Subunit: 490 residues, 4 copies
């Protein structure tokens, strides 16, 4: 008899144990959480507006000929502003994939610029990490620009940039313009305007969303905290809740503000989680602001929101798409529980199941490889020919990589977890492809964390078998109750 689990595309995955019965408040991000933007239409829109901004700022007209390719970028890549490389790294800074423009650099060639295949993530001045879903157009745009100036006769390829005659143009300064142009497109309203004049093309609409939020408000409180203003929030949220019937069958429609006990616009994260700004009330009918204490607020801080709701830290589950540093934990008051929305998880779960032949063949090659060394020890002079097997492993592994995209899986490359995956294991108590998967779990559910096995755990059976004394080293009242309570959330 095996353990029961819900369907794979309906599950909420557990990183740290969480008792849902103790949750009193449900907090939501808006962008890419409640308002899931259609891929790759939204990435293509941000890509176009950023290219237009760069062209209107002095960049050549050939950039207008670029088109966003959703098959290339993968979230969490590191851009080397010194050499103009997009880097896929592991949890400790080791290099997994290195792309200069559109050319993927092989192993021995990589050691010319990275002698130990290692980068220091601390070097924030040199390395820029593209972790957000808004960074997806920026990720592909950086590759197009490095590719363009590298294969352009008017420019001269160099180690740290390009030459336009007797004038040098570094990757760092070029990266600055791309950074300023993306900030411009987002903070000038160019992207917001094109979005709210065509919600059906860019914003996903689902009736499951008002159903889950209504059930959350029956067992506790629900609040919204978005960096966007109220105007853009009102248009987006009205679209997300525009249905002829209400949540329950046969019921009538009610405004989206009815599902929230507290609505907070202009959050200004991540400053929001520290001191933030002064909290000010918002008059929706007029747009007038007034500091101090309706349900629509502006600015403030996460602690001010925590106090207005009468909740405490661990009573809140914050649901969003963003990964934040250990700045909320460093506070002297309790931090929130986290639910990380990872939209890529939908396509990655399809590869995990609908490509079983690639996984099964990969395991068969490893069993066959282990048989060739089955009879060998430190006295064996033999060297079994594995060139044919390894060459087949690399082909199958690469075919699996291309199932996710040119940059491979978001969570791993081969046997190594990516830097992004380790940041998920750090920040997210729970994670899924969408917050809507909570609809398939009771509000009294006990989310239990799955053990993450080390090599000496996953490759050793619990079955019972002289041992060398070099390993055994020749081999206060004890507690009677459990010394830890991080698996029951009690």
């Amino acid at each position: 008899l095996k353990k029961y689990r819900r369907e794979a595309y309906h599950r909420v995955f557990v990183n740290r144990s969480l008792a849902m019965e103790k949750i009193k408040c449900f907090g939501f991000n808006m962008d890419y959480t409640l308002a899931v933007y259609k891929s790759p239409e939204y990435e293509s829109l941000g890509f176009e507006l950023t290219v237009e901004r760069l062209v209107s700022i002095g960049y050549p007209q050939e950039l207008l000929s670029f088109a966003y390719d959703s098959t290339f970028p993968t979230r969490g890549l590191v851009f080397d502003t010194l050499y103009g490389n997009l880097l896929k790294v592991d949890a400790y800074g080791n290099l997994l994939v290195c792309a200069h423009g559109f050319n993927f650099i092989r192993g021995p060639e990589t050691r010319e610029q990275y002698p130990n295949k290692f980068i220091q993530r601390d070097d924030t001045e040199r390395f820029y990490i593209l972790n957000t879903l808004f960074n997806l157009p920026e990720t592909y745009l950086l590759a197009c620009l490095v590719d363009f100036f590298t294969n352009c006769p008017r420019y001269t390829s160099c180690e740290t940039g390009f030459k336009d005659g007797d004038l040098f143009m570094s990757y760092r300064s070029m990266f600055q313009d791309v950074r300023d142009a993306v900030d411009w497109v987002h903070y000038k309203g160019s992207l917001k305007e094109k979005t709210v004049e065509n919600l059906e093309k860019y914003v996903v609409k689902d009736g499951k969303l008002p159903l889950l939020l209504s059930r959350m408000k029956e067992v506790g409180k629900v609040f919204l905290a978005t960096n966007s203003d109220y105007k853009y929030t009102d248009k987006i949220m009205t679209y997300l809740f525009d249905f002829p019937h209400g949540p329950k069958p046969g019921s009538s429609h009610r405004p989206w503000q009815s599902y929230f006990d507290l609505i907070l616009v202009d959050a200004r994260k991540p400053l929001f989680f520290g001191e933030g700004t002064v909290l000010r009330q918002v008059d929706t009918k007029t747009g007038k602001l007034k500091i101090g204490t309706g349900i629509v607020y502006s600015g403030g801080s996460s602690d001010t929101i925590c106090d207005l709701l009468g909740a405490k830290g661990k009573d809140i589950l914050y649901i969003g798409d963003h990964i934040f540093g250990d700045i909320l934990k460093s506070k002297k008051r309790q931090g929130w529980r986290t639910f990380l929305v990872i939209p890529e998880l939908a396509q990655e779960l399809h590869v995990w199941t609908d490509k079983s032949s690639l996984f099964e063949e990969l395991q068969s090659l490893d069993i066959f490889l282990a048989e060739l060394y089955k009879h060998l020890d430190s006295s064996s002079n033999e060297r079994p020919d594995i060139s044919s097997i390894q060459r087949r492993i690399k082909k199958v592994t690469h075919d699996m990589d291309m199932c996710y995209g040119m940059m491979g899986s978001l969570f791993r490359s081969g046997s190594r977890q990516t830097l992004f995956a380790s940041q998920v294991m750090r920040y997210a108590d729970l994670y899924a492809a969408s917050f809507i998967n909570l609809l398939y779990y009771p509000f009294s559910y006990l989310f239990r964390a799955a053990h993450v096995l080390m090599p000496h755990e996953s490759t050793v059976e619990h079955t019972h078998v002289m041992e060398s004394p070099l390993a055994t080293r020749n081999r206060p009242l004890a507690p009677q109750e459990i010394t830890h309570c991080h698996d029951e959330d009690d």
Copy 2:
């Protein structure tokens, strides 16, 4: 048909893939690698000499009544110099176990001093991490002192220390004396003297050791790099190789220096891995030193040793018990491959197999718990009574913790990996209970890394199953060859 694996207590576990055929040099630490000290006799000896040093420095005579208890300490604990706590933390600074003296603090009581059950490891001034095998006596000694002054009428318990009348004594200043006393015991020769006057009581002796080192020297080079001087190294290494016969059956004995192409004493690690000191030759027959370039050297640096052997970075496998920071990788030349000796792995593998009933019962409780929620979703008002099941899970989990010791497993507490385990996954390419497990592997073996599965990988079958558009988001030449080569070591 299942994959073949060698016996569990003979295996070398693979963190990152390593092709042994490419290794040309084998580097060895001496302490706790070649010279494995008998437990708990060696920890008890260092505990006694440190207590005597503290008593001879002004500490009360009651400390002489303490005896080292091997069942209490576990390597990798964090000592909070502000509150005098031994802390077992995870990879991200979250608290798992908290002990003040010998009293284990429960959950809600811990949040008084740690509001988010979180510490900042960056605070090196406040938090001291006890990662070495030499820190084991120090770990238990800190608990004895906190326990002693807490339950002593002559002193007054406080938050950050104790009161001896109108005089305050903080945990930080007390920790300083323990730190200075351990340095004194090691660097005064008190521990070295008691060791070399009774090698059979404190040092493990094994004939497998000269056999493996001889086979290493037949396929490549072997070097030694120890912080100890030549006098202590000569006595220890002569003991380790004192056998009537040589390595091969019927062969005769030859000196221990014959197994090494280069012997380096006074390494002065970790400075050794940077600029180190000036390399100086050592005359063994006289003890005279001379800077510049026998096989016995003193001081130097890891790059000087790398050049004397004619080897390059990845051609070397450094075998030792110590975990070093990302200082060797930051160099502009290639770093070494690593083999981490973890002596605790011998006892931990026994618990993994000889306690199968505890693991099986723990899995049965989780299957039974999943059945109670099998029919529930976000509409279910029911709250299944799990108080009896959880109370049983905590008892079984605690019984498993006590199998490793009062502080639990070195690698995990419950479902969370310890800070020590994540440092193993970062630094060690390979790890085992001893370097002697290489004797059961051919020098052409391809050590292949085992995938470390995330929750969404280990709890989802590859078997094939409308999906919500909130999760799917309404869904450059591609490379033809593999984009990464960190699984074949090529």
Copy 3:
């Protein structure tokens, strides 16, 4: 005899020696350098627009009753975002003046929040230094807000902020809104619009400016480097050169661009001094940009955008040694931390005009403080460690305190920009670090030849300034506790000559 010196209000003061003969390129900032803004008119304009912006985003209407008081703020104050205090500190972080709102905290009361009368300047999370001339309205606004919320009964005063009912408003959060509002005023054109629509009210004009710049271009190159766009620069620069003549009266007028070899707008300082942005040449006829440099006929233009200080060096064909950069801003140790040669610096400190007036027209106060100090030494004369006397000095100290306070108020409520009492301010030490030369205005260079050798004045330590170069005949032998019983052919340094 005595050394000749030019008139005090025409002087250029020298921190480090500089041979003007070797300067082949002259660089200019625009704001508060070439375009000197009227005081206190321009400060009050920024104050109004910033208060207006705060009220539009929810701050109470009582802020509209605030009026900028030019007699309160001194540049270079530190705002403690934890306790809401404006702090005047010395070069090492010691507290000199502490003001909570408009209330000045004195002596023992300061130790409640600052036990050692000391702050850690490195704690940039807590302390914000208001060094720029654009920070002057921001400095006075921060004091107005702290004073208003303290006095207004609608708010309860706490140690680190105020309580508005159940809501706590920290000083740090209030400071954030002030910074956001100041940036909004500058970076939404509201300040630029009011400036260009009344340039006679806000911008100073002087006919000596084209004359001095024309003489600079006769001996070398001249360039402009500003963070403003070309549109605002054109309106400002055309105004500064709007005279019915050229450099000399009677000569023909010529456009302001003719006075420069390179015009760099959108500089993006201080990022300009590192990697900056991609250099793009501006077509003033069209306004369109193009990265790099034009190749056709438009290459004869001199207007560029973005770029970096290294790129401007390459365009001018000038090494950093040969460049004198003239501006009002103090930059950190970055331009010299590189491997490329950094620029020489001329710092514009407009407050020097007023401070030099106090230094000369208030000689009565300086003479009395010296008299009181001479009389103090007389009371302790012929006293040593065996003397039991305790001369009554409380009468003299009260006169010292009274005369010293009257001197401070000659500069304003926060005192002199450079010192408070006998201690130099944090601002004064940063002038010493950054500036090779400094003056109230770059226009004082009009009174020096371009062959002039600016020789640095010695900054004397206490044992140098209070001891004469006279043979001290000691009858009793010097204590061996002090003497420890102790009984190259060419010069090894060259920073006072600058002749490499």
Copy 4:
């Protein structure tokens, strides 16, 4: 008239004002404070033992031919472990003197390794500052080693070290062996043994020391805080008080312990000023330690071990305000960075004895430099930006360089401890930061009453020292580019009076 001042060699110089009347506790370091070591005898003893230690661990025999040269090192030099240079820098990291071995690098050649003539002092991995008097032999040894390996043909000179055949020896690695050897000399008793076996040769004795300390204990408390053990302290202190009389001649001798209220050995500075170690009272009769304080009859002892500065404050019942700590070491911003009140500081700078002699007995050199500077101003008199003249000053500059170099050599090969030319050294700025008072020796306090008010001297900026307090009548109006067209009741600071 003129202000009265005590004789220059008896003066105590004042950086920050200090009312001695409020000082209730006097703290003393021992090494180079109470126990002033003979110069250059003690430096040469440390040099020999350090060279001897290096040779015993493999360094070549030619090092035994080295002889300490007291005329070479100046305190406070920076050793560049990358390029093997000794650097004399100013308060901001600008290079003044660069010496590779015994070769002084001048002017343009310095820019090869230091392109902006600048170092980043924060790079403690690369730069090591030799501030202490114990660093004096270490300073000269580093130059000897660089010079030897450069000249010896057995080694090939590289940019960052030397090649001994196929082995590269970096300057950083060589510097590590020097530091290890210096610590080994001090912390293995070899220097203590040679010191105590010949105290007349290495330690200065003066009868004024017990007199001054006895007068201090009449007006307050006196304590000792040293890193040395009690055994070495007893031998040293008994020597310093070994006279056939007490404080005054004709009075009875009494043990040195009678002059103190608290004796703190094994201080573990600078850790002492933070958390330190556990305080333990020493039983001088037995030598055994005991944490805390004795409760029986032994509580009347005054000898303690370890502890912290806060604990010593509590034992003396003294707030940090009331304590004047007298020593030779400069500490960073830590004692005042706490929440507890820090100590006032008296810095002992024994080099002042020699530097004051140069300042007075070499007045001919100062008078000529002033004459040359007056004549330089005369050549440029009546010249402005329109003048095309270029007066010949190369003759005067060579005389300025020659006279300046002769002045530097009066201090030694590395020049004065406090300045090089017109720029203060990095050491001088640290004296300004740390020390409230300073002198060649604490014994100069013998010439001041305990009611004396030490008043800080103004450290004048260029625009204050080169401008008189005289009304400047300007006929032409001041340029509005400089003036910007601009037309509390009690004192707000108290650091010059110190009367809280």
